[PDB]
C-alpha cells in the first residue's frame, strides 16, 4: 500500500511543523506582559439602541466613515442605520430570509449579504434611481455562506459551508481564485488592513492564512478543539484572534505561526459567535451564547468588563474604524451601540 | 432643535419603521414548515400534492398561508443552519415505507438516526412533527414478497402490512427522549391518494391553538 506510507510521510511532516514551531517557542505572551498595567474595570454604556428588527440578527458591519452600519436579519431585512441619530437610512428586502452574513463596502458604495441560498448578493447603495438594487448576484458555491467581506468595490472574498473560500470579481460575477483545503464547512473570514492576506476558520478546528493575489494557503493554525465560529484580524497586520464553540478564543500570530494567548474562563460554558478588536488592539471584544459580550484585555486576558444588555444570544459585534463605538447585534433583534 | 435635513431624516426613518412593522406583521401569519428526511423518501411527490441551495415552496389551503422549506440540497453540517430554523411551526419528516431492505446500510436505520437527531435536538423541543409514511403500495408488494425481519431482526410478528407498519410506526414514535412536550403526528399515504394536505392542516391547527394560548398569556 503506497497511500498508507504516503500518509505517514504526511504524519512526519506534521512532526517537523510542530517541533519547528515549538523550537521557535520560548516565552508565553503573559510571561512578558506582566510588566504592563491592566486597564481594569471599564464601563461602556448603551449610548444608542437601534430597534426595528423583528427576527434574529445574524450579522452587522460598520462603515469606514464610522457613522453608518448595516445589519442583516432572519426576517429578510438588511437595514442601514445612521448610528448617531438612530436613523434608518435604507431598508433592503432580501430574496432569501435565511442570511448568515453581511458586509459594508470600504468605499461605502455597496453592501453584501449571503446565506442558505448559497449566493452572496451585492447591493448598490448609491443609486441614481434612489432605491437599493442588486448589482451582481454571485452564485458559485454548493454550501451555505458564512462570511463574505469586500476587498475593493470589485473584489469580495466569500467563506462558505462547502470547505471553499472564494475570491470574486463583481463585473464578471465569476470567482477568480477558489481557495480549497479545509476539511469541513468554513465559518468566518477576516481581511488584512493592506488586503493582501486573509484568514478563515472552519469545523475542522483549523484556521488557515490565505494569500489573495496568488491563491494558496500560506499557513495553517490548529489550536482549537471544536468548530471555530468567528475570526478577527489584529490591526497591526501581524496577528489575528479567533473564536470557537468550546467557549475559548485564541490569539494566533502570522509571522511566528503559533498560538500566543488563550481567552477562556471557567464561568463560560458556551461558545463565541463573534470577535472584534479595538482601535489600538488593547481590547478584544467577544460575543457569547450566555447572552452577553465580554471584553478582554487582549494582551493580559483579563475579563475587564461585560457588555450585558441583551435578552438573547449575541450574534455579531464590531468596532468603528476610529475606535469610537461598539455595536453588538443579537438574537433578541436589538442593535446596541456601546461607548 | 435640529435642522430640516435631520427632520426629514427622522421622517424617512419613521416611514422605514412603518414599512418594517407591516412587513413583520405580514410575515408572522404564514406557517413555516421545515421539511426533513432522506432524499429518496418521495418528498418531490408530496411537493406536487401539497402544491441550488435551500428550496422554498408556497401553497395556501383554507385561508392559511404555508411556507415549506425543503433543505435537503444543503449537503453540509446540519447543526448551524438547524439552529437557524427554530421557531418553525411544524416539521414534515418523510420516511418511505419501501426502503426497509433496500440498500444505500439500511435506509430505515438512517431515517431513525435522522428522526432521533431532530427529536432530541435542543432547538426543537416544543415542535410538532408531521411524520409521513410514504410509498405504501411498494410496501404492500415488498411485504408480500419479503419479510421485514431482514430490516428488523428483533421483530417477531404477523408479517402482514398492518402489524409490521404499526411496528415500524411505533419504532419511529419511541425515539423521543421527552414525549410530553413534542406531539408527533403520523400518516399513511401513497402517490395515488389525494387528500393529504388535510392531515398537515389538522396538525398545524393544533399547534396554532397552543400558540394562541401562549399569545393570550395562558
Amino acid at each position, epitope marked *: 500500500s503506497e497511500l498508507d506510507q504516503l500518509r505517514q510521510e504526511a504524519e512526519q511532516l506534521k512532526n517537523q511543523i510542530r517541533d519547528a514551531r515549538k523550537a521557535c517557542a520560548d516565552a508565553t505572551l503573559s510571561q512578558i506582559t506582566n510588566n504592563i498595567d491592566p486597564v481594569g474595570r471599564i464601563q461602556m454604556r448603551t449610548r444608542r439602541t437601534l430597534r426595528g428588527h423583528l427576527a434574529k440578527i445574524y450579522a452587522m458591519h460598520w462603515g469606514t466613515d464610522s457613522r453608518l452600519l448595516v445589519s442583516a436579519s432572519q426576517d429578510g431585512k438588511l437595514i442601514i442605520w445612521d448610528s448617531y*441619530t438612530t436613523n434608518k437610512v435604507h431598508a433592503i428586502p432580501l430574496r432569501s430570509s435565511w442570511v448568515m452574513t453581511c458586509a459594508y463596502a470600504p468605499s461605502g458604495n455597496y453592501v453584501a449579504c449571503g446565506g442558505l441560498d448559497n449566493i452572496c448578493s451585492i447591493y448598490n447603495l448609491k443609486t441614481r*434611481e*434612489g432605491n437599493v438594487r442588486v448589482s451582481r448576484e454571485l452564485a458559485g458555491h454548493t454550501g451555505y455562506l458564512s462570511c463574505c467581506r469586500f476587498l475593493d468595490d470589485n473584489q469580495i472574498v466569500t467563506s462558505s459551508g462547502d470547505t471553499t473560500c472564494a475570491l470574486w470579481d463583481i463585473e464578471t460575477g465569476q470567482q477568480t481564485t477558489t481557495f480549497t483545503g479545509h476539511t469541513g464547512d468554513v465559518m468566518s473570514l477576516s481581511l488584512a488592513p493592506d488586503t493582501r492576506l486573509f484568514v478563515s476558520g472552519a469545523c475542522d478546528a483549523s484556521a488557515k492564512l490565505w494569500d489573495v493575489r496568488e491563491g494558496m494557503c500560506r499557513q495553517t493554525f490548529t489550536g482549537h478543539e471544536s468548530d471555530i465560529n468567528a475570526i478577527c484580524f489584529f490591526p497591526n497586520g501581524n496577528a489575528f484572534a479567533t473564536g470557537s464553540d468550546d467557549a475559548t478564543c485564541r490569539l494566533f500570530d502570522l509571522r511566528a505561526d503559533q498560538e500566543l494567548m488563550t481567552y477562556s474562563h471557567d464561568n463560560i460554558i458556551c461558545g463565541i459567535t463573534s470577535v472584534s478588536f479595538s482601535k489600538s488592539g488593547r481590547l478584544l471584544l467577544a460575543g457569547y451564547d450566555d447572552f452577553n459580550c465580554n471584553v478582554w484585555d487582549a494582551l493580559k486576558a483579563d475579563r475587564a468588563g461585560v457588555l450585558a444588555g441583551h435578552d438573547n444570544r449575541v450574534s455579531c459585534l464590531g468596532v468603528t474604524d476610529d475606535g469610537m463605538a461598539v455595536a453588538t447585534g443579537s438574537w433578541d433583534s436589538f442593535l446596541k451601540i456601546w461607548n | 432643535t435640529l*435642522s*430640516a435635513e435631520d427632520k*426629514a*431624516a427622522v421622517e424617512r426613518s419613521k*416611514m422605514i419603521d412603518r414599512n418594517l412593522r407591516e412587513d413583520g406583521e405580514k410575515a408572522a401569519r404564514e406557517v413555516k414548515l421545515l421539511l426533513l428526511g432522506a432524499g429518496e423518501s418521495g418528498k418531490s411527490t408530496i411537493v406536487k400534492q401539497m402544491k441550488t441551495g435551500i428550496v422554498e415552496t408556497h401553497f395556501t389551503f383554507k385561508d392559511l398561508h404555508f411556507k415549506m422549506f425543503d433543505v435537503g440540497g444543503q449537503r453540509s453540517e446540519r447543526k448551524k443552519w438547524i439552529h437557524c430554523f427554530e421557531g418553525v411551526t411544524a416539521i414534515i419528516f418523510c420516511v418511505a415505507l419501501s426502503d426497509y431492505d433496500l440498500v444505500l446500510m439500511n435506509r430505515m436505520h438512517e431515517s431513525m438516526k435522522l428522526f432521533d437527531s431532530i427529536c432530541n435536538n435542543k432547538w426543537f423541543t416544543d415542535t410538532s412533527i408531521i411524520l409521513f409514511l410514504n410509498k405504501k403500495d411498494l410496501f404492500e408488494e415488498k411485504i408480500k414478497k419479503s419479510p421485514l425481519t431482514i430490516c428488523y431482526p428483533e421483530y417477531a410478528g404477523s408479517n402482514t402490512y398492518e402489524e409490521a407498519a404499526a411496528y415500524i410506526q411505533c419504532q419511529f414514535e419511541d425515539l423521543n427522549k421527552r414525549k410530553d412536550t413534542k406531539e408527533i403526528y403520523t400518516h399513511f399515504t401513497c402517490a395515488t391518494d389525494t387528500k393529504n394536505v388535510q392531515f398537515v392542516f389538522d396538525a398545524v391547527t393544533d399547534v396554532i391553538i397552543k400558540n394562541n394560548l401562549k399569545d393570550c398569556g395562558l
Partner: single-chain antibody
Amino acid sequence: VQLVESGGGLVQPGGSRKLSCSASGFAFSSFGMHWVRQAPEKGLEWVAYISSGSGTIYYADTVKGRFTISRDDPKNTLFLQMTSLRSEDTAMYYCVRSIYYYGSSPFDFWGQGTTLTVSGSADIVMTQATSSVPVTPGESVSISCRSSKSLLHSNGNTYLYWFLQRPGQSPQLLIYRMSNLASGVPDRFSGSGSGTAFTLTISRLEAEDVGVYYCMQHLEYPLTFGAGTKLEL
C-alpha cells in the same frame, strides 16, 4: 431619470392653474420634493416642499396657504395647485427632487421647467458679491456669497448649496452642503470657509461653466437665494 413638467402658458389674473410635474424612471416614493421658481431676469426663489409619503408640507413665507401642493404615489406625479394668480406669479417654476439621509445629496436632480405668465424679518438672506464677471477661460475663478447668520450647525453640516443654471438649460447641483461635490460634476470644483464667509473656487474654467451660479441656505425655511453671478465670455 426624467421629470417632465406639464402645464403653464398664459392665464388671467385671479385665475387658477394646477401645475404638474410627472416623474418617470426612478423611485419617486422615497424622495422629498420641492418647487423652486425664478423671475425671468432675477435669481431663484423657493415655492414649497413636500416630503416623501406626504408627512410634512412647508410653504413659502411669501405665499403660504394660497398655493397648495399635492403628491400622488401610484402615478408618480406631483401637482402644484395655485389660486388667484397675482402679478408676482409670472415666473419660471422648477421641479426639484432631494433626499435626506446621512450622506445624501439634497437638491441634485431638477425638472425641465415650465413658464406661466399672468397679467421676512428672521429669514436668512443670501447676498452675492456681484451679478456679472468677465473672466477668460483657463484660470482660477472665485465666487463668493454672503449669509446673515452662521450656517454651521452643531452637528457639523453646513447647509450651503451651489447650483448652476446654464443659459437656456435647467439647473444642476455643483456643491451640496458647502464642501461636498455632486456626482456627475468634475472634480475641478471646490468650496470652503467658516460661518457666513464662503467662496466657490472654480479651477480651470472651460466653455461649459458659463451660466449663473446660485447659493442657497437650508438651516430652516424659506430657502433664500442670492442674485446670482452671470459668467460670460
